[PDB]
Amino acid sequence: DKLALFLKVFGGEVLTAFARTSVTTSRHMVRSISSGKSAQFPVLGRTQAAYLAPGENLDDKRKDIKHTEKVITIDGLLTADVLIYDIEDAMNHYDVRSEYTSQLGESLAMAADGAVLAEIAGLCNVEGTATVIETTQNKAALTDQVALGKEIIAALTKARAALTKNYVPAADRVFYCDPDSYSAILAALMPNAANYAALIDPEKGSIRNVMGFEVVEVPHLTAGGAHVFPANKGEGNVKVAKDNVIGLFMHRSAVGTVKLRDLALERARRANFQADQIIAKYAMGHGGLRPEAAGAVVFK
Amino acid sequence: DKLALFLKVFGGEVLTAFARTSVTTSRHMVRSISSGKSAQFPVLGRTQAAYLAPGENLDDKRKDIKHTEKVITIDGLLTADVLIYDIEDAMNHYDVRSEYTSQLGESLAMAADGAVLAEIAGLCNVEGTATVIETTQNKAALTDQVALGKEIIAALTKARAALTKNYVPAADRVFYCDPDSYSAILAALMPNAANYAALIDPEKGSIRNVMGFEVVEVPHLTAGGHVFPANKGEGNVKVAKDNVIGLFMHRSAVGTVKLRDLALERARRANFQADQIIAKYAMGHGGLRPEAAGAVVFK
Amino acid sequence: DKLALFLKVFGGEVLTAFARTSVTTSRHMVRSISSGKSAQFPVLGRTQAAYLAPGENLDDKRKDIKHTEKVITIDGLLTADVLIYDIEDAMNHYDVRSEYTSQLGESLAMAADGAVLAEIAGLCNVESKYEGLGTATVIETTQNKAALTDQVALGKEIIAALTKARAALTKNYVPAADRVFYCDPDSYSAILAALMPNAANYAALIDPEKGSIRNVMGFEVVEVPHLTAGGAGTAREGTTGQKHVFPANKGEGNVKVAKDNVIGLFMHRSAVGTVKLRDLALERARRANFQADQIIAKYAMGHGGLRPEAAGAVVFK
Amino acid sequence: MVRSISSGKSAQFPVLGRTQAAYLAPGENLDDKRKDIKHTEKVITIDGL
């Protein structure tokens, strides 16, 4: 019986473990939908024209808009698991449990990221509205630090710019950068010394607001090979892949997804050549959902 | 019952949602009518010599003038809506319910935007009469931040010339501009020192007073009455749209009335398989005494 | 709600007539339940056995290609209705009520059956195939349909035609035993001088009206008075632009099994069939547009799946 | 990594050669790659005081 309760404790440790490894939890959508193997959303758009008189009828006005609806759904399953070999599994476990929990937990998000990531750039890569931006001619020439904050930021101006005219508010948004170029390398941003209180990071792993959006990041970007994010391909009509690419721009409510049954862990004994096995599962995943606009930056 | 309750929370939600993307509520003039179709606004009297050394009275020379309230009324019911296919109902709330509130509200403002814009375009385009300023250089000579930040400010001076030399209550006034411009001017302000986050203004969702005026940058600048030869490059009328960004005003140079808060309801049609919503708003758009208006020019 | 009480009865009379009308009610995959906006149907396969030796492995038997089974969702609104006035519903009940039911039903049903043909058609234009190695050409006419007239002519080459339609059902493995065969009412008279020219067997060999033809050697015979027409999963009745409009229009210059080169479409059981939305509902309203009190009955359904294998038929040329 | 123990004077813990998470239809099961692996985890113990 007790060996059964222990599992509940492990599950609590996990879910809680998905955070702090949390990359993107907020800053995009999600829903509790039960038994729906799929789910959908609106598209439409913001636009307006002249107005009614007691004469005629409103009906005609809606011709051009081409209202649109869009649906996505779960794909395969999503998880790894771990094969314990524990007597200790019952007890003594303060160190061991932590180790085990981390190893799946961070992994789950580490899959989760790219699935919600690269496909955005894809949405920018078909021919979202469109966007891109750069500085002069290469990263070859431009190397040295503090310039590496400069050209970037200088781009960020235009970043805030095209955030308009397609509308959407600036109220909240975030850019997921790459940890190398990360922070502007904080120099150009902060040629100040001892104040990160001034840069407002009350934990949460987040640099406070810059002009436009907000700047955080996790390592790199990849998932979908483990879609199309041709880091290898320079152009081939599609430039928004990695190599090049840049720390990212996210535009309010461009994505999210549906998860059914939340997270469930299954515990087993598979005895072929064995110790013992546990199983946790997640059914959701996605790329998708018809963003309004978006973009990235490259060097060329 | 349940549906009505949902609709009721709705109205609230989008009510509070309206003023957000709304470019103007205050910083302008309005009234709440009671049952009236119309109204009228006194421009009134401001100059008074008040030298009373007894003789005559207020005289016929003072009787000869306009000072006539341009009356005003609705242009007809001004409201818009969008059709939906209902699934969410009383579930899937917060997110995805808010999407419709959104889709309607910003539009409900969006027209009003060009409206108060439209009056300004109308105001000095026909042939006092507050006015413009031109270039310092042609559109082709307009390239980067450094340049196009400054000439705005260069304009600002003689822009104030009208604000002042023409009298007017120098207390409170606003300037309207576009993000392409907004960028430029602010870029003229502080290329140095990080980000505009440093500007301590945004809590009021505004711009604390810059030289003269006050700053509210526009989203759009295209609606109707636009009614003015926006499309035309010039065709005289140098006041037109898409020559430039320089439109500006001051308080009580326009404004209008409305009807008894804001309400709405829905119903199906089923011609095609749906249940759709209708908001209803009065507003209208009042013109008024000309002053504080004009622009820069690219020519 | 007297109308609601009667509305249900009308729905019952509708669905009945409907099922009566169409070719597809059974003989295809039907899966649906509450709130499912999608569904997936396992392609699988079966050979195996119940046999084994202690040792080896059970699991060893698997190593199989694909169970992914293509989860698919609904195609959107599908609706056919009419305009009408109160009295037949208000009492009336009788003949008029019963009659209208069909009046909507057959048209909707006729569209529904053709939807499967449309969806099936796109994936097989001139094959795809290659368990289930291949299909078989149904080939030869022994003389052209131009010259084919009487029922003792076709019937002789009809039994000769489906001979290899008794072939592809073998080479694909599968329970080829209980199956179906579709044709045209132009050939309605053909089986007569084929099946049993001695008298017409009714009280002896049985074979009365079964709602279809009691099984001949292989297959079976039912009929669908038109072919290329129909469509589903959309705002429906219209000139065209439907997906199914399969390339029947091109008979030769390749494009062999394309319709109107053919008669005898031979296919098997459970190659297709789809989802549907939560039983069926409908309702009325007032319009007054032109004195209008009218009804609406809408559908969702869904569409087909499985492997790229489509039928075949007899030929010319 | 740092373990703990009570009077063990020795211990064993796992290694990191294979893991991820992934996605599949119920077509197949994993662990072939896992069969290809060498060892799994090895133990360790005290050295002196």
- The phi, psi pair for B41, rounded to 5°, reads -120, 115
- Declared resolution, Å: 4.6
On the question of a cis peptide bond just before residue A92, with omega within 30 degrees of 0, the verdict is: no
> Among the residues of A19-143, which ranges form H helices?
94-115, 118-125
Pairs of CB atoms within 8 A across A/D: 41
Residue of A nearest to B91 (CA): A33
Q: Please tell me the number of Cα atoms within 13 Å of C105 on its side-chain side.
A: 21
Quick one: tokens of C176? 């080829």
Instruction: Name the residue among A165, A167, A210 with its Cβ closest to that of B197.
Output: A210
Nearest-CA residue of chain B relative to A163? B179
How many C-alpha atoms does A94 have within 13 Å on its Cβ side? 4
CA dist list (Å): B95 to A30, A146, C294: 9, 41, 36
Backbone phi, then psi, for C105, in 5-degree steps?
-60, -50
d(CA C145, CA C157): 11
Q: Which residues of chain A neighbour D13 with C-beta distances below 8 Å?
A: 96, 99
Calpha distance B18→C23 (Å, rounded)? 55
CA-atom Rg of chain B in angstroms: 23
Strands C282-286 and C38-39: unpaired
Residue C228: both structure tokens together: 């290329």
Tokens of A135: 């500085």
Q: Checking phi first, is residue B100 left (phi over 0); if not, alpha (psi -120 to 50) or beta?
A: alpha
Q: Do C66 and D26 touch (CB under 8 A)?
A: no
Kindly state the tokens that stand for C126.
């001139």
Sign of torsion over alpha carbons B160, B161, B166, B171: positive
Name the residue of chain D whose CA is nearest to A270's CA: D31
**Backbone CA torsion sign across B191, B196, B199, B201:** positive
For C299, list phi and psi in degrees, rounded to 5.
-135, 165
* Four-point Cα dihedral A161, A162, A166, A168, nearest 10: -60
End-to-end CA distance of chain D: 20
The Cα A133–Cα A299 span in angstroms is 8
Two tokens, residue C234: 């959309």
CA B116 vs CA A164, A271, B184, C16: distances in Å:
20, 77, 24, 62
Query: What is the distance between the alpha carbons of residues A56 and A226, in angstroms, rounded to a whole number?
Result: 58
In this complex, whether B and D touch, counting 3 or more CB pairs under 8 angstroms, is no
| Residue from C33, C35, C37, C72 to probe the interface with A (highest A Cβ count within 10 Å) | C37
Residue C275 near residue C39 (C-beta atoms within 8 A)? yes
Partner-chain contact A39 C37, CB within 8 Å: yes
- B contact set with C (CB within 8 A): 268, 270, 272-273
The whole-angstrom separation of Cα A242 and Cα A248 is 11
Mutant choice from A31, A59, A72, A73 vs C, greatest count of C C-beta within 10 A: A73
Percent of chain A that is helix, strand, coil (3-state, to 5): 25, 15, 65
Experimental method: cryo-EM
Rounded Cα distance, B121 and B293, in Å: 9
Sign of CA dihedral A94, A95, A101, A106: positive
C32-37 long-range contacts (CB < 8 A, ≥24 apart) are: C32/C275, C32/C276, C32/C277, C32/C278, C33/C278, C34/C278, C35/A35, C35/A36, C35/C278, C36/A35, C36/A36, C36/A37, C36/C275, C37/A36, C37/A37, C37/A38, C37/A39, C37/A40, C37/A71, C37/C73, C37/C74
- Return d(Cα C47, Cα A278) in angstroms, integer: 34
Q: Are the CB atoms for B11 and B264 separated by under 8 Å? A: yes
Its sign, for the CA torsion C183, C188, C190, C192, is positive
Q: Which two tokens stand for residue C196?
A: 């049993």
CA distances from B197 to A156, B176, B182, B252 (A): 13, 21, 15, 32
Task: Give the separation between CA C134 and CA C168, rounded to whole angstroms.
Answer: 7
Q: Which residues from D are below 8 Å from A when comparing CB atoms? A: 1-6, 13, 19-25, 41
Question: Within chain C, where are the H helices?
Answer: 2-21, 94-123, 151-161, 168-171, 192-195
Query: Which of B21, B86, B145, B220 should be substituted to probe chain A, the one whose Cβ sees the most A Cβ atoms within 10 Å?
Result: B220
- Collect all residues with Cβ–Cβ distance below 8 Å to B151 and sequence separation of at least 6: B135, B136, B137, B296
C36:A37 CB<8 A: yes
Q: Which residues contact B127 (CB under 8 A, 6 or more apart)?
A: B236
Q: Which residues pair with A29 in a beta bridge?
A: A256
Say if CB A295 and CB A131 are below 8 A apart.
yes
Question: CA Rg, chain D, in Å?
Answer: 17
The amino acid that residue A250 corresponds to is: M
Query: Hey, what are C85's tokens?
Result: 């006035």
Residue C219: name the closest of C194, C197, C244 by CA.
C194
Q: What's the burial of C21, exposed, middle or buried (CB within 10 Å: 0-12/13-18/19+)?
A: middle
Q: Strands D10-13 and C293-299: what pairing?
A: unpaired
What CA–CA distance (Å, rounded) separates A143 from A57? 63
Q: What are phi and psi of C316, to 5 degrees?
A: -125, -170
